[PDB]
């Protein structure tokens, strides 16, 4: 296989950029895919019962044509994200509809409109080739990716690229995603691989880390400062765990909300101390399908003050949505910020505007990250200030099982997938920094 | 009669500060009041049928003792605000409860805990006396007021005083309000009277103007810039009218939402061109009492785009609340801001968070104004850039009727009240500036 | 003649995108150029004495190869900027040095390293062709350009593209500038032509207008709000004029500093009332080569308060640098902003830091504009809110003379150049909007 | 002796508020003072040879009358600051001039125009009395102070009180400062004492700590975020030490500049790893009296990049002024911030504006702190996140000597003074939090 020659070049210690340029490209690559004819195979069934092992295929697919500003990457490792799982169960809607509609725009966008969809929105690996107009990345460069795909033809994004109107999430609204031996990305998705991490560790933070960085640290989100009290929902999950790391690393105090004592112990292993178990507390913020219970908002706030010395939180890091959002608005301090990047329990939010207007509060929407924020989030990983949260790794063959585990919230850490890497534990080229941070790296 | 002597000194050309200091203070003053014994007067009645003319009394009341950082003001004119009307009908609760509870804190706070409540949250007049520790205002200074009363003992308010935790609205959570011949205020409520306006015109903008300035113009609100498209609900009302003025004056484009062709004509008089009549279009944002119709959100946004050349608004100036808020979040441009200072149709807001998070929008809460913002809003009036919106003036003795007219939304402009001023049209000391802006000044009449 | 057919398609009513696609491309085009061999023809002479008519040639040059993300544009008109002039006299260094060094990066960048340099940093015209990966612009589209050329490969610029580390100014640090019949630009430089303007009018605002917009209006600069007092140096020049327009249209008060009464009347024609003639007042901010005179700073501050009723400016719009910068820091209000985008009188600034730190002031640097800011500036032109300032127009063959006119500031409006346009007055397709604004459009002629 | 009774109540475990209220006030108190008669006792003498042990007297002085919004505090400990030292040598002017001029305003301000000046701008102690209008503080409350005295009569300060125009620094532009047994402060200067610190430790951070907080952490300064690179001049001094602490505790990376290997070891003791010894490197930023050397600027930039892996600093924490400011502007990253609160080496700054405008940098002035910022900085001390930096402690009698040590930079840590406290080590009320942090608390000695 030409593929074997690529992997052998990576696993050797020695290959120079010209050696990568001179390698023959394979004529196919192994990829985890969805099949267009199966869009409706889950109809009438409840979301919890839909089994991603039944919809995810392991196929050999041809390589796509490389366009300007793009790179073909040999993928050593990837990860499973929530968006991958939703895609794998054809929810909220099949991902093919957008591929087909976008494909009408031009021959280039038509490349993605195929009868199969290669999924995955994280990656760590090695650049094999770059298209026209690219100078900043070369064959051989070790990379991770962020998943924002923006064209930047509209002016709207030129003061923060999340404002670009023509926006796709790579591996979700794009083909040729990361759960595969090769991937196609824009070069403005590439970031330098942290050298103290293995391939699977380096591929794990991207999507959730960068989302939490924009949402909590950056000026485009909550603009955290040291001393702040931060209420963090779901603090042991992917997102919430990065939020907790950001709160502690920036000199602030996270108030961690979890659902079980073992999740509380995960929060403690990250160094949090104020942890609220909402299952043990029994918060019922909604008394109806339609009405909430302000008494319970107030009980949450009192609990928070037990940990803060009577202070209300400066920031709420929201993403459960409707179930918690009314409480989040109520408990926030006068002048404070509720920052939201998801609505996992429901997107129709309801809140008492008296608390927001009369106390000068603010609800700020945030959505993954611009290239600078993604670079900054990954830089904090590379400096050893933020650590990966891997809790289990699967082989590419096993991605269906991996997706299930995420679907059923089976692990608290990230679930990684080896793609071309033949085993865990490869890729580290800074052993000193890794030794410095080893216990934290392995905490999950 | 000591009060007559005070009025005479004001109406005379040329009373000096020492003259005001030498005037004897009367032992009572006439005030529009509520009586503690009547707070249950409107029980079991619909808010529509509650008549302020039955609750508001014209009483002679003694002068309060003057505390540090305070001023006694001879009031020439005041205005009726929504908070005055709500107070006059004992909604959502009687103002007496807060007066009593707050009065426990100290002898100074107990001054306000009386069996009567003098209302009013705007004023224009002349300083008569100042308490201990005051250097910036003197007897004889011509003043308007803003209605934020903050103690500033807590550090919280020292980077924007709206964050002060111990905050009262003068005339609502305080006694000795402006609908009366005299009033007591903190000196950090005083602002210089605009010289081209009459007393009743000068007392007219304070509350709603300053609220709209913070909400739309200042960096603590939406931070308007020229070129922005701004959707303004209820654009002929007091608040919305000031918002429209600020949009135009700042070089932005207001998209005015009104309920009637008459109100649309009012918006045209202010200089607006893009006007949507929600009754002509018949928007139904709510299907149930529980479920909204996104088709109608979309129909609104289409209408807006007809006026803007395909563009979505950078800013939504919200204050109707539940009825409109969903639509407001939906139509806002990617990266845009919904700024809210009230929920007049109801405070339980419901919106689709997908539009907010996925399009990076924000909802910013605002509430009247810090002293700097209130100074800036009044300064724009004094420079002739923003104009009062008086539509009708009453005598102090008929304040009840004034309240009723506000209760029933009878005029689009502010409703003013003469207090000590014997007639309308007095108090102008810059006739040149007045002449330059006279037509705009009178547009709401 | 293939170029003639291109022009005829443009001048005709109604050529469609497919017609432009079908036109044969010429094998050369006429262009104003510098010649690499001549870069020392001014060595050892005073900058004032260097004649651009002696260095600017009119050549037939081959067409460049079109790369990804680029457009070939048929250019109807352009403009002379200060960077064009500095280029034409090989100052501070010859433009060829950078073209050569940058040409070593890739074959694409190597396209610009030629023995001739086609200058020009503004354009108005019609898209002929687009390179690989372009969906937003098509043959036939009427365009103006902004001059920022950024690759956006670094993450640095993805929260404001002015932070990109690899940026070039088109027509100064790139070849194939706008003073020619054809030009090559990135498609992320293209903006829609304002339809009420002629070709030469539409080409004139771009560089200076976008710079002034970022500097004064945007949150990345001074973040103007209505009511602000703004000191504007050189208020009749190219940058100063747009700043004056922005201050007025945003509801603020420009304090216009000029050097002659003729310029003062230009400012009055733009609507400004508070105007200071630095030559009439005789300001000498510098005592000698090394020390300033704070008494003159203070005399300027007193003159400003004569126009503001005792208020110090919220914002100083700086671009003269050393001669004025100490004064600008001094006169700024407590908490105010000095925003700076040039140092035309000298770049070693000297100021008294006591005033900056003890009064919580800030100095903010600004440099042309990101694509969103350039779009917003051009959008305000298209809306009729900001007007072009054309004072004179030359034919492409006369570009040398035109450079000279700018070298010696013979005019205060912009100097435009026709390129393919055979005469002035062509290109208007919104006659009603032009008619509404015609007096202001022509105010500078 | 009434003063002994006050001390005994403090040293007692359990005096209640009513007990402090019942204590008789003494008719005099011991105070470190300057005497008006001796203003010109150092004339023609170089600031180095001026001795504060000659000009500082220890006197018995009557108690001032307590005004509205004020507290009389029994002072257990204080601190020597740079402003104290400048005062003690009558530089740049004698403190008495302002005291007299301000004393001309009212009888309250005339309280401070006395033939003696009690100095001191930090305090830790116990409230004895409060004046009219004070609810938030009571006799018995354990307090530290910040030194901003603002009247807040102007609107200007009501969105950040550092913008107040009528602003004095307590103990410098005010009498009855902290180097004494009793002091008079506005109650809006009072903050809760950190319970894990001794009296002398609690009095030490106030001024320099709040200044560094506003300058580096708050949005009114540089707005630090984790990951930032921060160049910190004078990193072992009073200001620079707190700045290093904030940089580390906020997740940023301080690049600490010091002048000697011993100071470098101090920075290591605070937890910093990247340390440049300006005297080991021998930086010569100025060639002569009037011109600088960009090669030295660049050499500093390259040394910084050795520690950051080739990244330039996001923030420069400036306060040496003229000697370093040019370099500071140059080394700052594109889009970065230079934040300045002093000019100890000279206030006429000279920098090359090309680097500031073409790379979109900003210079932000900062000055001590508003009450919210001072509260936040003291809160970080109370939470155990920022630690006092006491290096040496004197008795009130030795205050003269203390000033001298600070005048000659004898000590890197803050220099503290016991006032009423009989000895060191007293006042700790949270022994477990102290035990948790004891190594850090004592790191400077
Ligand atoms: Cl594509
Ligand atoms: Cl009170
Ligand atoms: Cl190029
Ligand atoms: Cl000044
Ligand atoms: Cl005083």
């Amino acid at each position: 296989r030409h593929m074997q020659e690529i992997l052998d070049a990576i696993l050797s210690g020695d290959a120079a950029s010209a050696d990568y340029a001179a390698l023959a490209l394979p004529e196919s690559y192994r990829a985890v895919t969805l099949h267009k004819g199966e869009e409706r195979m889950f109809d009438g069934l409840a979301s919890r019962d839909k089994d991603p092992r039944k919809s995810l295929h392991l196929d050999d697919v041809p390589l796509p044509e490389l366009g300007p500003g793009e790179a073909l990457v040999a993928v050593m490792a990837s990860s499973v994200n929530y968006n991958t799982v939703w895609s794998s169960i054809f929810e909220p809607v099949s991902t093919f509809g957008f591929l087909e509609r976008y494909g009408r725009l031009s021959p280039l966008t038509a490349r993605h409109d195929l009868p199969y969809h290669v999924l995955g929105s994280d990656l760590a690996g090695v650049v094999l080739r770059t298209g026209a107009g690219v100078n900043a990345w070369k064959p051989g460069d070790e990379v991770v990716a962020h998943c924002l795909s923006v064209e930047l033809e509209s002016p709207d994004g030129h003061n923060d690229t999340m404002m670009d109107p023509e926006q796709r999430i790579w591996g979700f609204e794009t083909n040729f995603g990361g759960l595969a031996q090769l991937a196609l990305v824009k070069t403005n998705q590439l970031l330098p691989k942290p050298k103290h991490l293995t391939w699977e560790e380096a591929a794990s933070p991207g999507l959730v880390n960068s989302t939490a960085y924009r949402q909590l640290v950056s000026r485009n989100g909550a603009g955290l400062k040291q001393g702040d009290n931060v209420l963090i929902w779901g603090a042991s999950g992917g997102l919430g765990s990065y939020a907790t790391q950001y709160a502690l690393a920036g000199g602030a105090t996270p108030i961690c909300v979890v659902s079980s004592p073992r999740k509380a112990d995960i929060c403690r292993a990250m160094g949090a101390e104020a942890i609220i178990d909402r299952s043990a507390e029994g918060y019922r913020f909604w008394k109806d399908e339609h009405h909430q219970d302000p008494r319970e908002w107030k009980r949450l706030g009192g609990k928070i003050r037990e940990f803060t010395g009577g202070e209300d939180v400066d920031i709420v890091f929201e993403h459960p949505g409707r179930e918690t959002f009314g409480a989040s608005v109520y408990v926030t301090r006068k002048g404070g910020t509720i920052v939201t990047c998801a609505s996992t329990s429901g997107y129709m939010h309801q809140y008492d505007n008296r608390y927001l207007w009369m106390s000068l509060k603010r609800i700020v929407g945030s959505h993954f990250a611009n290239y600078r924020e993604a670079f900054e989030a990954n830089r904090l990983v590379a400096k050893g200030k933020i650590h990966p949260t891997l809790s289990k790794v699967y082989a590419l063959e096993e991605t269906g099982q991996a997706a299930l585990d995420v679907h059923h919230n089976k692990h608290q850490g990230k679930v990684g997938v080896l793609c071309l890497a033949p085993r865990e534990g490869l890729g580290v080229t800074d052993p000193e920094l890794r030794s410095k941070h080893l216990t934290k790296i392995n905490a999950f």
Side-chain angles (χ1 to χ4, degrees), chain A residues 97-115:
Chain A
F98 179 92
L99 295 183
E100 300 154 357
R101 271 183 273 108
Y102 204 65
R104 299 160 198 181
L105 184 74
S106 78
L108 283 172
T109 76
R111 297 168 301 163
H112 298 261
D113 173 17
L114 293 162

Side-chain angles (χ1 to χ4, degrees), chain A residues 15-34:
Chain A
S17 183
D19 297 320
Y20 286 106
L23 292 159
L25 302 182
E27 287 187 27
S28 68
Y29 69 95
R30 203 102 173 127
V32 181
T33 68
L34 303 166

Side-chain angles (χ1 to χ4, degrees), chain A residues 236-237 241 266 270 388-391 412-414 440-444:
Chain A
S236 61
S241 95
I266 297 158
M270 289 190 284
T389 54
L390 209 50
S391 61
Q412 290 316 291
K414 289 282 306 188
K440 291 183 178 301
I441 287 165
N442 284 325
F444 273 79

Side-chain angles (χ1 to χ4, degrees), chain A residues 215-237:
Chain A
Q215 187 182 352
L216 189 53
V217 182
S218 87
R219 295 184 179 187
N220 291 326
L224 181 75
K225 65 194 183 295
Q226 67 192 269
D228 277 353
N229 289 303
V230 187
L231 183 71
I232 303 191
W233 295 102
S236 61

